[PDB]
Write an enzyme that holds these catalytic residues in place. Sequence first.
Site, PDB file in Angstrom:
ATOM      1  N   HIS A   1     -44.407 -10.375 -22.516  1.00 38.47           N
ATOM      2  CA  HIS A   1     -45.401  -9.558 -21.854  1.00 38.47           C
ATOM      3  C   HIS A   1     -45.257  -9.634 -20.328  1.00 38.47           C
ATOM      4  O   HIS A   1     -46.218  -9.513 -19.591  1.00 38.47           O
ATOM      5  CB  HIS A   1     -46.808  -9.947 -22.322  1.00 38.47           C
ATOM      6  CG  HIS A   1     -47.032  -9.819 -23.784  1.00 38.47           C
ATOM      7  ND1 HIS A   1     -47.717  -8.748 -24.315  1.00 38.47           N
ATOM      8  CD2 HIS A   1     -46.794 -10.646 -24.831  1.00 38.47           C
ATOM      9  CE1 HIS A   1     -47.842  -8.898 -25.637  1.00 38.47           C
ATOM     10  NE2 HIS A   1     -47.279 -10.060 -25.981  1.00 38.47           N
TER      11      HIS A   1
ATOM     12  N   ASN B   1     -53.087  -7.497 -29.173  1.00 35.84           N
ATOM     13  CA  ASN B   1     -52.043  -6.448 -29.036  1.00 35.84           C
ATOM     14  C   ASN B   1     -52.604  -5.085 -29.462  1.00 35.84           C
ATOM     15  O   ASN B   1     -53.706  -5.027 -30.053  1.00 35.84           O
ATOM     16  CB  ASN B   1     -50.818  -6.770 -29.895  1.00 35.84           C
ATOM     17  CG  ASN B   1     -49.866  -7.793 -29.304  1.00 35.84           C
ATOM     18  OD1 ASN B   1     -49.846  -8.026 -28.100  1.00 35.84           O
ATOM     19  ND2 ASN B   1     -49.111  -8.436 -30.182  1.00 35.84           N
TER      20      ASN B   1
ATOM     21  N   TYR C   1     -49.832 -21.532 -24.887  1.00 33.87           N
ATOM     22  CA  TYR C   1     -50.410 -20.900 -23.721  1.00 33.87           C
ATOM     23  C   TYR C   1     -50.889 -21.939 -22.703  1.00 33.87           C
ATOM     24  O   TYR C   1     -50.914 -21.631 -21.484  1.00 33.87           O
ATOM     25  CB  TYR C   1     -51.556 -19.924 -24.019  1.00 33.87           C
ATOM     26  CG  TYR C   1     -51.159 -18.703 -24.806  1.00 33.87           C
ATOM     27  CD1 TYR C   1     -50.746 -18.819 -26.120  1.00 33.87           C
ATOM     28  CD2 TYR C   1     -51.250 -17.436 -24.285  1.00 33.87           C
ATOM     29  CE1 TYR C   1     -50.369 -17.710 -26.871  1.00 33.87           C
ATOM     30  CE2 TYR C   1     -50.875 -16.314 -25.016  1.00 33.87           C
ATOM     31  CZ  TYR C   1     -50.512 -16.453 -26.347  1.00 33.87           C
ATOM     32  OH  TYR C   1     -50.187 -15.363 -27.109  1.00 33.87           O
TER      33      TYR C   1
HETATM   34  C1  HDD Z   1     -45.835 -19.720 -30.149  1.00 33.20           C
HETATM   35  C2  HDD Z   1     -45.803 -18.798 -29.193  1.00 33.20           C
HETATM   36  C3  HDD Z   1     -46.465 -17.501 -29.314  1.00 33.20           C
HETATM   37  C4  HDD Z   1     -46.822 -16.762 -30.479  1.00 33.20           C
HETATM   38  C5  HDD Z   1     -46.729 -16.924 -31.942  1.00 33.20           C
HETATM   39  C6  HDD Z   1     -47.529 -15.688 -29.789  1.00 33.20           C
HETATM   40  N1  HDD Z   1     -47.483 -15.668 -28.465  1.00 33.20           N
HETATM   41 FE1  HDD Z   1     -48.502 -14.456 -27.127  1.00 33.20          FE
HETATM   42  N2  HDD Z   1     -47.693 -15.447 -25.573  1.00 33.20           N
HETATM   43  C7  HDD Z   1     -47.027 -16.625 -25.630  1.00 33.20           C
HETATM   44  C8  HDD Z   1     -46.644 -17.309 -26.741  1.00 33.20           C
HETATM   45  C9  HDD Z   1     -46.931 -16.814 -28.120  1.00 33.20           C
HETATM   46  C10 HDD Z   1     -46.756 -17.247 -24.274  1.00 33.20           C
HETATM   47  C11 HDD Z   1     -45.323 -17.720 -24.090  1.00 33.20           C
HETATM   48  O1  HDD Z   1     -47.469 -18.526 -24.153  1.00 33.20           O
HETATM   49  C12 HDD Z   1     -47.284 -16.238 -23.278  1.00 33.20           C
HETATM   50  C13 HDD Z   1     -46.398 -15.876 -22.084  1.00 33.20           C
HETATM   51  C14 HDD Z   1     -47.218 -15.895 -20.824  1.00 33.20           C
HETATM   52  C15 HDD Z   1     -48.515 -16.542 -21.218  1.00 33.20           C
HETATM   53  O2  HDD Z   1     -49.513 -16.698 -20.555  1.00 33.20           O
HETATM   54  O3  HDD Z   1     -48.450 -16.849 -22.604  1.00 33.20           O
HETATM   55  C16 HDD Z   1     -47.761 -15.150 -24.253  1.00 33.20           C
HETATM   56  C17 HDD Z   1     -48.254 -14.026 -23.731  1.00 33.20           C
HETATM   57  C18 HDD Z   1     -48.985 -12.981 -24.527  1.00 33.20           C
HETATM   58  C19 HDD Z   1     -49.668 -11.882 -23.869  1.00 33.20           C
HETATM   59  C20 HDD Z   1     -49.809 -11.507 -22.395  1.00 33.20           C
HETATM   60  C21 HDD Z   1     -51.054 -12.060 -21.772  1.00 33.20           C
HETATM   61  C22 HDD Z   1     -51.080 -11.532 -20.320  1.00 33.20           C
HETATM   62  O4  HDD Z   1     -51.214 -10.267 -20.135  1.00 33.20           O
HETATM   63  O5  HDD Z   1     -50.866 -12.302 -19.360  1.00 33.20           O
HETATM   64  C23 HDD Z   1     -50.312 -11.229 -24.965  1.00 33.20           C
HETATM   65  C24 HDD Z   1     -51.138 -10.000 -24.855  1.00 33.20           C
HETATM   66  C25 HDD Z   1     -49.895 -11.949 -26.132  1.00 33.20           C
HETATM   67  N3  HDD Z   1     -49.142 -13.002 -25.866  1.00 33.20           N
HETATM   68  C26 HDD Z   1     -50.412 -11.644 -27.472  1.00 33.20           C
HETATM   69  C27 HDD Z   1     -49.950 -12.216 -28.692  1.00 33.20           C
HETATM   70  C28 HDD Z   1     -50.462 -11.822 -29.969  1.00 33.20           C
HETATM   71  C29 HDD Z   1     -51.427 -10.708 -30.292  1.00 33.20           C
HETATM   72  C30 HDD Z   1     -49.752 -12.746 -30.887  1.00 33.20           C
HETATM   73  C31 HDD Z   1     -49.789 -12.802 -32.364  1.00 33.20           C
HETATM   74  C32 HDD Z   1     -50.971 -12.515 -32.895  1.00 33.20           C
HETATM   75  C33 HDD Z   1     -48.925 -13.553 -30.056  1.00 33.20           C
HETATM   76  N4  HDD Z   1     -49.115 -13.273 -28.739  1.00 33.20           N
HETATM   77  C34 HDD Z   1     -48.125 -14.662 -30.586  1.00 33.20           C
END
Ligand code: HDD
Lengths: 678, 678
Positions: free
Chosen positions: B62, B135, B349
């Site tokens: 993202h 999402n 996160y």
């Molecule tokens: C195990 C890791 C993992 C898994 C399974 C998910 N994500 Fe996540 N997501 C992350 C690890 C992550 C992250 C690496 O931790 C991010 C990158 C930047 C941050 O702040 O968190 C992230 C960012 C991120 C963002 C951007 C937030 C922003 O605008 O700053 C959204 C909207 C989502 N995710 C949504 C989802 C949804 C709806 C998931 C399944 C239901 C999902 N993610 C599964």
Amino acid sequence: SPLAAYEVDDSTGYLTSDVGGPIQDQTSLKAGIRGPTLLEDFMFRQKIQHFDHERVPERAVHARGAGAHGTFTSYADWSNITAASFLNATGKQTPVFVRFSTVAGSRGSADTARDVHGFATRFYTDEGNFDIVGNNIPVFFIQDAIQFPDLIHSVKPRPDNEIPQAATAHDSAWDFFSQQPSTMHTLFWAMSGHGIPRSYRHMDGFGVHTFRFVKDDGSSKLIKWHFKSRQGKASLVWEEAQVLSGKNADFHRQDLWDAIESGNGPEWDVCVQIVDESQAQAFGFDLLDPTKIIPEEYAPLTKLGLLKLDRNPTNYFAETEQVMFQPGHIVRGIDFTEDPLLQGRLFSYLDTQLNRNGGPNFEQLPINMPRVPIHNNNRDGAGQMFIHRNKYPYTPNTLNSGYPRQANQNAGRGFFTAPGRTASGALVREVSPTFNDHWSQPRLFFNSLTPVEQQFLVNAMRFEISLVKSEEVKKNVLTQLNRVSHDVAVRVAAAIGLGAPDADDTYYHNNKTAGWSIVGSGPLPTIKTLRVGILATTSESSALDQAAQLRTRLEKDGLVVTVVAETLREGVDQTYSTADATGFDGVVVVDGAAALFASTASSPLFPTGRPLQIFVDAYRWGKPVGVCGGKSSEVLDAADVPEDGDGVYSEESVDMFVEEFEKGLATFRFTDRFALDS
Amino acid sequence: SPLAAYEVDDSTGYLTSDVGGPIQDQTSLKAGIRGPTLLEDFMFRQKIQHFDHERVPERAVHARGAGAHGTFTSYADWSNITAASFLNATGKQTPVFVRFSTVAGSRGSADTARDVHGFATRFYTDEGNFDIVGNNIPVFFIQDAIQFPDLIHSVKPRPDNEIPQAATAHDSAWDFFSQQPSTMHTLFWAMSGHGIPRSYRHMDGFGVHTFRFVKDDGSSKLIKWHFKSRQGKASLVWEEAQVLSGKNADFHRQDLWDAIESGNGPEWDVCVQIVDESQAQAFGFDLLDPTKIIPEEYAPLTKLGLLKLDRNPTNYFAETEQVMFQPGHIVRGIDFTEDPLLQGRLFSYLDTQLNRNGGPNFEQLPINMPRVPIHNNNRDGAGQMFIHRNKYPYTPNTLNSGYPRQANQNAGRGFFTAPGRTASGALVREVSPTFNDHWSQPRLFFNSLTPVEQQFLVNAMRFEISLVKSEEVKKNVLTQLNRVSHDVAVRVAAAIGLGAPDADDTYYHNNKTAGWSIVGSGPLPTIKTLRVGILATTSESSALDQAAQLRTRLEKDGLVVTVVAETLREGVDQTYSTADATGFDGVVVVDGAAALFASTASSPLFPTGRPLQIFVDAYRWGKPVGVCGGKSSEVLDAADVPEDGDGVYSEESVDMFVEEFEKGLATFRFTDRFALDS
Ligand code: HDD
Ligand code: HDD
Ligand SMILES: [Ca+2]
Ligand SMILES: [Ca+2]
Ligand SMILES: [Ca+2]
Ligand SMILES: [Ca+2]
């Protein structure tokens, strides 16, 4: 690979942690089959922690780029001009790494944005790493490094909403250009075809700054670096660049990667202009001024050797993303000048690596390591990989017998400052009056373009300036343009419904110089790697047979052939659905496919009119186009393309067709298809 | 607000260092007017150091996104289902910040890539920050968080050359999808119009996971979050998304910014489906499984309140880039479930913000601060911005009188884990058999699309899979698609010249559900903010007068009108050179401009055929198009557009034209213009 010692192979074997313990990584450990995940799942955490920390800050500028390995070969013993060891013998080979880039865009922005382009070369010499951190344009926007954040803030997206990406087409950039007239020379180059090159291979590299070559006797000369492409110079047209930014953001990096993989690794002659110290102000401007070029008519190029890129990286992140260039990476035989733009760069590149790497040991990354021994008293820091045996890392010492020894002009092949350099006068924050002519050389550049090129440059300015919201900024822009050329100001003003200011002829002149024009640099010296799309159909066995025959004849001469049809099968590379004229340097329709070439032509397998659109787009963007098989007038009439046109081909004979077509690919662009003012 | 206190005004005053010393920043300090730059120039170094360190790591996913401030308003006192304080009274208002995003692209990639989209909402509640990190698609690709790096590595660029940017159209992604069948549901959604939404405002938000609502008495229910757009659902078409990725990489962020600035800030109903704990497995699948949706026919939506975005940020970097969301940011009245995808997210996160921020005090950044007092024993760390008075930061203590006090179910309005939750069984790294049906719900989704939408989905798969080089991966893909639908597999196979495997009917069915279809969700409920391009000419006073008349009538109804002509002047917003059909939701040609639409039409001020191409592209992409102001068969004939067509308007009368045209903008897309299989 030069970095083979660092490679890790995963073609066999069981998954391990980073400490070699065999593990699994597909299911979390839970308290029961439908239970919560356990904190004691070290397999989960180590994997996700790594993932969570994969990213590093993109470069502050030139974030979008790509790189490759190669070799530099000296053409001679250059001791007569420089002590530099990598230049000291005919045939002497040094490994290189090059990264090419845009400037303004962030790391996933499009390759074909209009921009200045980076051309950064590392020579891993037997006397240390030497970097030449250049651009594809020989002059820079600003005359003092301290202004660099102002330039970059102005051209990068507006900081409230971060719009627009990778473009100078907004108010802030043109505000800066209009208020800072030094910008005019680079602005003209960026607004020409040099702003949208056909590939990294079809552009030159320039050091921009005056440097010094220093001989072992201490004498010095002033030099400019020019890397002259052996593939020739070529540009996109703007409307093509724009579509290509959507269809293939990766166009230039894919082009480079593919050329290397097919054994067509790009080459440049590494050249210098060399002049005496006494000529610092002889050419009608100051050689310390990075907004000025020495015309080749006044100072010819000397070819020093050959740069060839011929190996792609194994891991983009580890090699291309982590390569950390510095103009501070200098070797004996080279020295700086008092160019105030260069002077400040020396600070920036050492500092910024702390940001990228997060620690001070960034020269220990494989891509950054030298290929000779390191002997110094630098110690500790985060990420320290070396285990230093010398337990007395200070000078002067007796407890390590005075080692490491000092290196200088007379011992140890030390770097030394050119010993004839001096400074005189007050300590000042003042601009040299010798830098004050911001308009003559922009005019020389404009004068040196062909008429169609001048039109394309005017059209680029009309495009960008028409998107500036501020009427005051637009007026200010025309004021500055008008100092270069009244005609440019008039022609640009016409598109934005302002009047141009009255002519101000202080800097007007009619002088020209060779070697700046793209259109004027004659046919390409090779057409190897150029892309031919052959538009065919599955509805006629004869069309696929014509396509196969053409494929054979074109591939024989090293062209990259794509056969396009409605659906894939043997012999067909791409569907109409994925095909676009931006994918090709030339388009051929086989005359068994003529029925597809209605604009009405409709199918669930591709967008309405797609086959003809590809042909029409190719024609309109100045590409060689043709129909092969003898029946041309149904396709050419649908497309509104005249049979008699230059760069339009029709022949029954595959051999005759290809012979003609290949001359067209060398011509590259048929500029007669573009309308001119007045 | 922590934000207001940290606002900095630079509309007046003299330049200072970061420590308030007035300085200059335009010329370096040098030893003489043409001399070297001095190390003692602290003005130079502080400015360049700051510039050198401006960048931070982009988010790992993202990375490309945009944000805005707003307000959430509760519709009722929801105490009867949750203890959550922000839902505890009719009309209770809570500030929000929302960031929308793509998934796979890097920071400067195009908004209109095909992808899953982020919709992340922060509620700054009076009992702490609560984030719903959702999402635009209600299901996720994988059933266990430990797999997330695998998914993400597969969809991001190939790691040798970092190609291709922001796309699943490459071998590795389709290899992953074909080997990991859980991916099928989200894959169908991303391949539908939900992969290319018209705007952030025209998409919904989903929490994806089952959560719990927990009452103050300790009882819990299972919930799904759905944010339902009050602007309606709308999509681009693929060919339009591709051109738009090149013409305007900033399209979605520009759309959002502009809507807010014009007083058309987007709205959503924040809703839940609510079911009993005993229904975890009642709907034919497991509510712990994040690849499954509860059909509304089984569990209807309850509207909890209104989300409105109505204020743009001041500084993109400080607000949008730095906002650090976490599903760990939970409040009393909400709890997690044992969804193994959710469980693992909680770790990621918190960890990843150390990467982005470079230090542990990221919750002190203004955009991350809460709006209530912080009382805890967290201390020190890099970047510590607080001066803690409490010099006994440990529990239990007497020397600070036992403060801070512990908060739990019984006191201090503490967070508490739903007390009905249990675990039982072996500690296992095993997938629940209840998760094993990866194909029924993808089929339900496909069955619930209209015929033209099913064709667009098939066409997106034909496009992407045709670009997969490996024949084995393509075969493996068909095997998986075939388990969802034999018809999909047959139709996709036809484009790539393979045969589909024999029907395997284990998971085939004919069931449908409401509310997933974009095309089927009827006309938009408002046309405010939609863009009308009016194609005119400066060569006819009558054309500009027709354009002005149309402008007045369209602007009255809140449409954003662009008049296009050869050159700018009063009444004309944009030149043909900068105009493209991707800039408009509807295109109107004025009768007086008919001469520009002839095939012999050429100009130095725009590319050949540009005026007609805009009209034809608009028509082909399903947009309302028309000619206004005569007996106007000349433009429709040049374009090969039939007057009798749905969404084609031809009227002399401005008033009649606009009334018809505005119904077309509500219909939005005329799907009859797209060919179907057979
Ligand atoms: C195990 C890791 C993992 C898994 C399974 C998910 N994500 Fe996540 N997501 C992350 C690890 C992550 C992250 C690496 O931790 C991010 C990158 C930047 C941050 O702040 O968190 C992230 C960012 C991120 C963002 C951007 C937030 C922003 O605008 O700053 C959204 C909207 C989502 N995710 C949504 C989802 C949804 C709806 C998931 C399944 C239901 C999902 N993610 C599964
Ligand atoms: C005072 C600061 C400053 C000034 C005046 C310049 N630059 Fe620079 N340049 C940087 C500060 C910088 C930087 C912030 O330090 C970068 C970002 C990443 C890096 O390693 O250095 C950079 C990167 C960078 C790269 C990318 C190297 C790579 O691919 O990794 C190129 C090609 C250039 N620059 C070229 C130039 C040229 C030809 C200049 C003028 C003649 C120039 N820069 C002036
Ligand atoms: Ca701006
Ligand atoms: Ca050109
Ligand atoms: Ca791949
Ligand atoms: Ca508890």
